[PDB]
Write a protein that holds these residues in place. Structure first.
Motif, PDB file in Angstrom:
ATOM      1  N   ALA F  94       0.823  -1.206   0.000  1.00 47.37           N
ATOM      2  CA  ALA F  94       0.000   0.000   0.000  1.00 47.37           C
ATOM      3  C   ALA F  94       0.858   1.257   0.000  1.00 47.37           C
ATOM      4  O   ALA F  94       0.543   2.232  -0.691  1.00 47.37           O
ATOM      5  CB  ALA F  94      -0.940  -0.003   1.202  1.00 47.37           C
ATOM      6  N   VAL F  95       1.945   1.254   0.773  1.00 51.12           N
ATOM      7  CA  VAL F  95       2.848   2.402   0.805  1.00 51.12           C
ATOM      8  C   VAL F  95       3.495   2.614  -0.557  1.00 51.12           C
ATOM      9  O   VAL F  95       3.615   3.749  -1.032  1.00 51.12           O
ATOM     10  CB  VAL F  95       3.897   2.220   1.917  1.00 51.12           C
ATOM     11  CG1 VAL F  95       5.019   3.229   1.770  1.00 51.12           C
ATOM     12  CG2 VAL F  95       3.242   2.371   3.276  1.00 51.12           C
ATOM     13  N   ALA F  96       3.921   1.527  -1.206  1.00 53.44           N
ATOM     14  CA  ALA F  96       4.518   1.648  -2.534  1.00 53.44           C
ATOM     15  C   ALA F  96       3.519   2.198  -3.548  1.00 53.44           C
ATOM     16  O   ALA F  96       3.863   3.066  -4.365  1.00 53.44           O
ATOM     17  CB  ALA F  96       5.053   0.293  -2.990  1.00 53.44           C
ATOM     18  N   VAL F  97       2.278   1.712  -3.506  1.00 53.08           N
ATOM     19  CA  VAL F  97       1.261   2.200  -4.431  1.00 53.08           C
ATOM     20  C   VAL F  97       0.963   3.671  -4.170  1.00 53.08           C
ATOM     21  O   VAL F  97       0.787   4.454  -5.108  1.00 53.08           O
ATOM     22  CB  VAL F  97      -0.011   1.339  -4.343  1.00 53.08           C
ATOM     23  CG1 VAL F  97      -1.131   1.954  -5.160  1.00 53.08           C
ATOM     24  CG2 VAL F  97       0.269  -0.060  -4.833  1.00 53.08           C
ATOM     25  N   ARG F  98       0.908   4.074  -2.899  1.00 55.68           N
ATOM     26  CA  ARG F  98       0.674   5.479  -2.583  1.00 55.68           C
ATOM     27  C   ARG F  98       1.821   6.356  -3.063  1.00 55.68           C
ATOM     28  O   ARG F  98       1.595   7.460  -3.573  1.00 55.68           O
ATOM     29  CB  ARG F  98       0.462   5.660  -1.083  1.00 55.68           C
ATOM     30  CG  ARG F  98      -0.872   5.157  -0.596  1.00 55.68           C
ATOM     31  CD  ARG F  98      -1.350   5.948   0.598  1.00 55.68           C
ATOM     32  NE  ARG F  98      -2.678   5.521   1.016  1.00 55.68           N
ATOM     33  CZ  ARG F  98      -3.791   6.198   0.771  1.00 55.68           C
ATOM     34  NH1 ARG F  98      -3.770   7.343   0.109  1.00 55.68           N
ATOM     35  NH2 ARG F  98      -4.952   5.712   1.194  1.00 55.68           N
ATOM     36  N   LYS F  99       3.061   5.892  -2.894  1.00 53.47           N
ATOM     37  CA  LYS F  99       4.205   6.658  -3.373  1.00 53.47           C
ATOM     38  C   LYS F  99       4.160   6.822  -4.885  1.00 53.47           C
ATOM     39  O   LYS F  99       4.463   7.900  -5.409  1.00 53.47           O
ATOM     40  CB  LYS F  99       5.511   5.989  -2.951  1.00 53.47           C
ATOM     41  CG  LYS F  99       6.741   6.833  -3.241  1.00 53.47           C
ATOM     42  CD  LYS F  99       7.947   5.974  -3.576  1.00 53.47           C
ATOM     43  CE  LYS F  99       9.195   6.826  -3.732  1.00 53.47           C
ATOM     44  NZ  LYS F  99      10.446   6.050  -3.515  1.00 53.47           N
ATOM     45  N   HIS F 100       3.792   5.760  -5.606  1.00 56.51           N
ATOM     46  CA  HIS F 100       3.627   5.891  -7.051  1.00 56.51           C
ATOM     47  C   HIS F 100       2.466   6.815  -7.397  1.00 56.51           C
ATOM     48  O   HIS F 100       2.511   7.528  -8.406  1.00 56.51           O
ATOM     49  CB  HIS F 100       3.422   4.519  -7.689  1.00 56.51           C
ATOM     50  CG  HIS F 100       2.864   4.581  -9.075  1.00 56.51           C
ATOM     51  ND1 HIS F 100       3.655   4.758 -10.188  1.00 56.51           N
ATOM     52  CD2 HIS F 100       1.592   4.492  -9.530  1.00 56.51           C
ATOM     53  CE1 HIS F 100       2.895   4.779 -11.268  1.00 56.51           C
ATOM     54  NE2 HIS F 100       1.639   4.618 -10.897  1.00 56.51           N
ATOM     55  N   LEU F 101       1.423   6.824  -6.569  1.00 57.48           N
ATOM     56  CA  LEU F 101       0.194   7.528  -6.917  1.00 57.48           C
ATOM     57  C   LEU F 101       0.329   9.034  -6.754  1.00 57.48           C
ATOM     58  O   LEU F 101      -0.253   9.790  -7.538  1.00 57.48           O
ATOM     59  CB  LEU F 101      -0.962   7.005  -6.068  1.00 57.48           C
ATOM     60  CG  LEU F 101      -2.359   7.129  -6.668  1.00 57.48           C
ATOM     61  CD1 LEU F 101      -2.379   6.584  -8.079  1.00 57.48           C
ATOM     62  CD2 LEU F 101      -3.360   6.396  -5.799  1.00 57.48           C
ATOM     63  N   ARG F 103       2.716  10.817  -7.505  1.00 60.83           N
ATOM     64  CA  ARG F 103       3.369  11.340  -8.697  1.00 60.83           C
ATOM     65  C   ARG F 103       2.557  11.123  -9.963  1.00 60.83           C
ATOM     66  O   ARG F 103       2.771  11.831 -10.950  1.00 60.83           O
ATOM     67  CB  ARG F 103       4.745  10.692  -8.868  1.00 60.83           C
ATOM     68  CG  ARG F 103       5.764  11.136  -7.844  1.00 60.83           C
ATOM     69  CD  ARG F 103       7.099  10.463  -8.088  1.00 60.83           C
ATOM     70  NE  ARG F 103       7.035   9.040  -7.779  1.00 60.83           N
ATOM     71  CZ  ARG F 103       7.122   8.072  -8.679  1.00 60.83           C
ATOM     72  NH1 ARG F 103       7.270   8.336  -9.967  1.00 60.83           N
ATOM     73  NH2 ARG F 103       7.054   6.806  -8.277  1.00 60.83           N
ATOM     74  N   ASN F 104       1.632  10.170  -9.958  1.00 66.04           N
ATOM     75  CA  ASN F 104       0.816   9.845 -11.124  1.00 66.04           C
ATOM     76  C   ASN F 104      -0.648   9.894 -10.692  1.00 66.04           C
ATOM     77  O   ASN F 104      -1.231   8.882 -10.300  1.00 66.04           O
ATOM     78  CB  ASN F 104       1.196   8.482 -11.678  1.00 66.04           C
ATOM     79  CG  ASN F 104       2.663   8.394 -12.024  1.00 66.04           C
ATOM     80  OD1 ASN F 104       3.505   8.183 -11.153  1.00 66.04           O
ATOM     81  ND2 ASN F 104       2.980   8.566 -13.299  1.00 66.04           N
ATOM     82  N   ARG F 105      -1.240  11.085 -10.771  1.00 65.53           N
ATOM     83  CA  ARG F 105      -2.618  11.260 -10.332  1.00 65.53           C
ATOM     84  C   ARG F 105      -3.620  10.631 -11.290  1.00 65.53           C
ATOM     85  O   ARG F 105      -4.729  10.291 -10.866  1.00 65.53           O
ATOM     86  CB  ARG F 105      -2.924  12.747 -10.160  1.00 65.53           C
ATOM     87  CG  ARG F 105      -2.046  13.424  -9.130  1.00 65.53           C
ATOM     88  CD  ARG F 105      -2.361  12.927  -7.731  1.00 65.53           C
ATOM     89  NE  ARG F 105      -1.495  13.538  -6.731  1.00 65.53           N
ATOM     90  CZ  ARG F 105      -1.764  14.671  -6.097  1.00 65.53           C
ATOM     91  NH1 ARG F 105      -2.876  15.346  -6.333  1.00 65.53           N
ATOM     92  NH2 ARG F 105      -0.895  15.135  -5.204  1.00 65.53           N
ATOM     93  N   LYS F 106      -3.261  10.468 -12.559  1.00 63.50           N
ATOM     94  CA  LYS F 106      -4.174   9.927 -13.556  1.00 63.50           C
ATOM     95  C   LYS F 106      -4.215   8.406 -13.569  1.00 63.50           C
ATOM     96  O   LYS F 106      -5.002   7.832 -14.329  1.00 63.50           O
ATOM     97  CB  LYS F 106      -3.799  10.433 -14.950  1.00 63.50           C
ATOM     98  CG  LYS F 106      -4.436  11.756 -15.319  1.00 63.50           C
ATOM     99  CD  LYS F 106      -3.881  12.288 -16.624  1.00 63.50           C
ATOM    100  CE  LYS F 106      -4.464  11.532 -17.803  1.00 63.50           C
ATOM    101  NZ  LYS F 106      -5.709  12.174 -18.305  1.00 63.50           N
ATOM    102  N   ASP F 107      -3.392   7.739 -12.763  1.00 59.22           N
ATOM    103  CA  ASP F 107      -3.392   6.279 -12.700  1.00 59.22           C
ATOM    104  C   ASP F 107      -4.558   5.833 -11.824  1.00 59.22           C
ATOM    105  O   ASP F 107      -4.403   5.439 -10.666  1.00 59.22           O
ATOM    106  CB  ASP F 107      -2.063   5.757 -12.173  1.00 59.22           C
ATOM    107  CG  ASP F 107      -1.670   4.434 -12.799  1.00 59.22           C
ATOM    108  OD1 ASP F 107      -2.573   3.656 -13.166  1.00 59.22           O
ATOM    109  OD2 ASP F 107      -0.457   4.167 -12.919  1.00 59.22           O
ATOM    110  N   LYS F 108      -5.760   5.899 -12.403  1.00 56.34           N
ATOM    111  CA  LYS F 108      -6.951   5.454 -11.689  1.00 56.34           C
ATOM    112  C   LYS F 108      -6.949   3.946 -11.485  1.00 56.34           C
ATOM    113  O   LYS F 108      -7.580   3.447 -10.544  1.00 56.34           O
ATOM    114  CB  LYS F 108      -8.199   5.904 -12.441  1.00 56.34           C
ATOM    115  CG  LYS F 108      -8.271   7.409 -12.611  1.00 56.34           C
ATOM    116  CD  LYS F 108      -9.333   7.824 -13.604  1.00 56.34           C
ATOM    117  CE  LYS F 108      -9.249   9.314 -13.879  1.00 56.34           C
ATOM    118  NZ  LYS F 108     -10.167   9.732 -14.972  1.00 56.34           N
TER     119      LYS F 108
END
Ligand SMILES: [Mg+2]
Ligand SMILES: [Mg+2]
Ligand SMILES: [Mg+2]
Ligand SMILES: [Mg+2]
Ligand SMILES: [Mg+2]
Ligand SMILES: [Mg+2]
Ligand SMILES: [Mg+2]
Ligand SMILES: [Mg+2]
Ligand SMILES: [Zn+2]
Ligand SMILES: [Zn+2]
Lengths: 98, 160, 102, 70, 83, 150, 24, 91
Positions: F94-101, F103-108
């Motif tokens: 979850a932390v990794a996905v949040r860190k990626h997210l 920076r990438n707001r359009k990755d719905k």
RNA sequence: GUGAAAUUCUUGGACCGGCGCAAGACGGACCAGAGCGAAAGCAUUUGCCAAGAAUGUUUUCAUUAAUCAAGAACGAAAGUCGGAGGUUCGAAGACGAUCAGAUACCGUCGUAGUUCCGACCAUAAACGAUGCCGACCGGCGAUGCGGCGGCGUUAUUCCCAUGACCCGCCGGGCAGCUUCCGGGAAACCAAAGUCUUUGGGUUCCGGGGGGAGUAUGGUUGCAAAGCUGAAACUUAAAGGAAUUGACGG
């Protein structure tokens, strides 16, 4: 893979080894000659970075430039504050090869 | 060429005219429409690669290469589809063995060695261990830059 | 009543298939629904092959082919008689009509 | 052909072209007759090639998504 | 077949069936003794090992993990453990 | 069927019917215990300890040879992880996905995966608090979780 | 009528009704 | 408690200037008066001083930025493009 | 350009051919009853970032699970707001044709839109008109991925590995053919079977046709509109699947 490796090794330095967090304590440990690895955030001021590098060269100890920042270095240490410089007295987990 | 293939064409732009003779130089090559449309067939994968590469004398070339997966003579399956990693490795291989036939030599001996499409033939040889290919050619090359048009180079390309 | 099991198209495990334009009327037809004919025609008529051979500067010159892929909506396909309506049991087979080589 | 003959041209390369683009790719009825008339009028014939403009992909073809209703 | 003996299937179809769908679960994997050339000791290696197994007396790799089975390095001998 | 996927896979491990220790295994219970202790000192989670033990040292089941499970052995010696392994890994994901997210707001798609992962995290945490492994007031917060994993 | 055009007619009438009621 | 249902920061403007204009200026004012995390010292004290000027109270670093946000998307894409053209220019 | 024309462009060089320049779209053929994704949907190359199914497993935990009022994320196209961009196509609109009329079908032009970023809307024949999890109940040939075992051919190499074919087996999928399993009003469906021999768990939902998804109230939305949602009154049928005939520009 290097960043996750150093983060995991840093986590394992906590809870298993002797470290110290911060600038003044890092310099104190270096000039006592018991700092075996010094980690610097890239957010560090350039003068502080260069001075700590010179201190490490005098003490013949390794410096690792963390690919994060003081916020991310603090999170990697498991703390809820920014740490910009840290020293490992002894790893206990083969981060520092014998 | 006296006895070569007929599906290959050349552009041959004219640079200098002296007397009643227009003297040309290489501008690009291309395959014909019928050969290209005959090569593309169903139940097989085709790999397309391009690379911008500069010759030793300053000519910049965009080489396009095509290659089609070849079914075995004993193959029962209708289709011969290469996996995405296989196609990617083939594309990388045939980019890096179009670069080296251009980077280390002049335009003249590039042109004379793409005349029999030796580059495509060795690309076909190089990719046999990944997935067999049969129709491998340098589909197109186009001239991107030309170096200042020295007359001596043009005359030695024409004459001796 | 459901006329066809595949609903007249090849879409099985997809949600959306990109549309194409009918070559006859430029209707937006899904790619898996349109009728496709890959015509491979000699670039000259069979009446003129001899005359082109006579007028050719070459001796062993192979006449080039003409490769065109055609897409039809079922309206234009039926109106142009490439496909025909079939009986209820005759709709089920998928074998293309034979080439009739002899 | 007669104009080419009186200007001293004896052989011709052929480049058949359809409408191309996003429109039709089939050559019109005049291609066969034009080429046959060139051949039988004494003109020599060289290479023949299709040069129809084929898009790697084109803009939207005219007519709308329901096409040309007739 | 209406009278297929489900109590006593012959070993052929017992082997061909899935590991879970057998009459009694039996793993397809096993253990092996691997002999490294130039070495004397014996290392017991899982047939489907997921990790690179090394000799402790020599800095040499024994098996490379793959999708299903660890692939032994060439020149290495192997036998079975109690079938 | 999978919890948050429409997958119905069968890939499992078929534990053999013979619970007895193989005769060629020379390692005693205390030897395997000391190996687990060392590998826990190195920082290996019980899954990795089992994988290393089976791959290299030829022990089939730690439970079969010692009578105790790996996590039981670690907890008895007193060096089990503060968080359970699977919950720790889910929080890490979850932390990794949040860190990626961030920076990438359009990755719905990543947002949907984050929702699924955090739902799994909450269900597993509710289970662990039911078993009282976790404190009754333990709670997963998105902001503060990054200091716990990696 | 086609059902879609009955729906469109109903929507037009509904907007007219809303405008009339808001006028009061 | 929650004091305003939707106006938030533009509740100071009352009923004036129109709902759409207040909504349009709401996010601009939020970004204008927000405090951004300083990229030099790591503290969340980088706040706007004047239009286009952003000053951090901790390290006393002043940065030229956008009118209402610390950095504009235009400038970020420009910085990336200039980096790419620099690494293309040299070899 | 069309069925035929005409509006339109044209000695001011229109169309055509050649050489360049620019812009914005679009990624043909390969492309399949093939793949992936919760759906919507996703097709030039390369790199980065996270994620995922399936498989392999003598790894770990040990019931943590299934379905789910309320609530939440996403949600084609069209539509709205703001900023860029605007090549093609093209609602509106203009004109030319056709016609008894032609506010259309055909043709020329053409605004919004169609393209990107940011914020709304939450609807589609959003379809498989077919809820999810689990068990059982025929055969056959394929195909996609993973794995396992085999005569051989092939690629380098000196041999095995590893690729590409050939022959099988297993597991999960997209599907297909066939069958008096069985069901169904039938069409058909290996699920729409295991149902008067009626009970695996669970969610949503229908009660003759209209009025009507209307009025009103509530609530969401910038708006368009979305969700919830009657009654009076009217009507003896409305419908579904198949059969024969009649008819078909
Ligand atoms: Mg019908
Ligand atoms: Mg759809
Ligand atoms: Mg018609
Ligand atoms: Mg939309
Ligand atoms: Mg706009
Ligand atoms: Mg137009
Ligand atoms: Mg149920
Ligand atoms: Mg009713
Ligand atoms: Zn059509
Ligand atoms: Zn600062």
């Amino acid at each position: 893979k290097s960043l996750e490796s150093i983060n995991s090794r840093l986590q394992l330095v906590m809870k298993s080894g002797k470290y110290v967090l911060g600038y003044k304590q890092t310099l104190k440990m270096i000039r006592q000659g018991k700092a075996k690895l010094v980690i610097l955030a890239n957010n560090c001021p350039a003068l502080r970075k260069s001075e700590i590098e010179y201190y490490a060269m005098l003490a013949k100890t390794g410096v690792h430039h963390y690919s994060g920042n003081n916020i991310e270095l603090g999170t990697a240490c498991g703390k809820y504050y920014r740490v910009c410089t840290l020293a490992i007295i002894d790893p206990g987990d083969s981060d520092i090869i014998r | 060429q006296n006895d070569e293939v007929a599906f290959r064409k050349f552009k041959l732009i004219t640079e200098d005219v002296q007397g009643k003779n227009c003297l040309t130089n290489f501008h690009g090559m291309d395959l014909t429409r019928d050969k290209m449309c005959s090569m593309v067939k169903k139940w097989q994968t085709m790999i397309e690669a391009h690379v911008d590469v500069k010759t030793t004398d300053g000519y910049l070339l965009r080489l396009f290469c095509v290659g089609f997966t070849k079914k075995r003579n004993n193959q029962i399956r209708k289709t011969s589809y290469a996996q995405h990693q296989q196609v990617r490795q083939i594309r990388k291989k045939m980019m890096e063995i179009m670069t080296r036939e251009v980077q280390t030599n002049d335009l003249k001996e590039v042109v004379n060695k793409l005349i029999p499409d030796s580059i495509g033939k060795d690309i076909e040889k190089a990719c046999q261990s990944i997935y067999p290919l049969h129709d491998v050619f340098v589909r197109k090359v186009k001239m991107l830059k030309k170096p200042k048009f020295e007359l001596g180079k043009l005359m030695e390309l024409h004459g001796e | 009543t459901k006329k066809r099991r595949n609903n007249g198209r090849a879409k099985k495990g997809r949600g959306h298939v990109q549309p194409i334009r009918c070559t006859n009327c430029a209707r937006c037809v899904p790619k898996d629904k349109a009728i496709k004919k890959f015509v491979i025609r000699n670039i000259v008529e069979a009446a003129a092959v001899r005359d082109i051979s006579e007028a050719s500067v070459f001796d062993a010159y192979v006449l080039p082919k003409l490769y065109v892929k055609l897409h039809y909506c079922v309206s234009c396909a039926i109106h142009s008689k490439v496909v025909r309506n079939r009986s209820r049991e005759a709709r089920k087979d998928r074998t293309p009509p034979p080439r009739f080589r002899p | 052909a007669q104009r080419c003959k009186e200007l001293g041209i004896t052989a011709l390369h052929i480049k058949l072209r359809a409408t191309g683009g996003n429109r039709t790719k089939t050559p019109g009825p005049g291609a066969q007759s034009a080429l046959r008339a060139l051949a039988r009028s004494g003109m020599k014939i060289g290479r023949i090639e299709d040069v129809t403009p084929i898009p790697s992909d084109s803009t939207r073809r005219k007519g709308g998504r329901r096409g040309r209703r007739l | 077949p209406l009278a297929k003996d489900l109590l006593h299937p012959s070993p052929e179809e017992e082997k061909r069936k899935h590991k879970k769908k057998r009459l009694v679960q039996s793993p397809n994997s096993y253990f092996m003794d691997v002999k490294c050339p130039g070495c004397y000791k014996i290392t017991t290696v899982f047939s489907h090992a997921q990790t690179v197994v090394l000799c402790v007396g020599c800095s040499t790799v024994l098996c490379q993990p793959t999708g299903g089975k660890a692939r032994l390095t060439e020149g290495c001998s192997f036998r079975r453990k109690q079938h | 069927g999978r919890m948050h996927a429409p997958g119905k896979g069968l890939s499992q491990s078929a534990l053999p019917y013979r619970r007895s220790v193989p005769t060629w295994l020379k390692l005693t219970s205390d030897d395997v215990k000391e190996q687990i202790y060392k590998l826990a000192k190195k920082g290996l989670t019980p899954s990795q300890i089992g994988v290393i033990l089976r791959d290299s040292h030829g022990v089939a089941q730690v439970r079969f040879v010692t009578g105790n499970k790996i996590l039981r052995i670690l907890k008895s010696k007193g060096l089990a992880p503060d968080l359970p392994e699977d919950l720790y890994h889910l929080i890490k994901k979850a932390v990794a996905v949040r860190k990626h997210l961030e920076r990438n707001r359009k990755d719905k798609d990543a947002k949907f995966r984050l929702i699924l992962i955090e739902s799994r995290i909450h269900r597993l945490a509710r289970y662990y608090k039911t078993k009282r492994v976790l404190p009754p007031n333990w709670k997963y917060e998105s902001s503060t979780a990054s200091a716990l994993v990696a | 009528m086609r059902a879609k055009w009955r729906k469109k007619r109903m929507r037009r009438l509904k907007r007219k009704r809303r405008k009339m009621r808001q006028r009061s | 408690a929650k004091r305003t249902k939707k106006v938030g920061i533009v509740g100071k403007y009352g009923t004036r200037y129109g709902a759409s204009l207040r909504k349009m200026v709401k996010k601009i004012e939020i970004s204008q008066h927000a405090k951004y995390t300083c990229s030099f010292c790591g503290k969340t004290k980088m706040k706007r001083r004047a239009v286009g000027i952003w000053h951090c109270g901790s390290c006393m670093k002043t940065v030229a930025g956008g009118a209402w946000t610390y950095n504009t998307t235009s400038a970020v894409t420009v910085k990336s493009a200039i980096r790419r053209l620099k690494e293309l220019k040299d070899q």
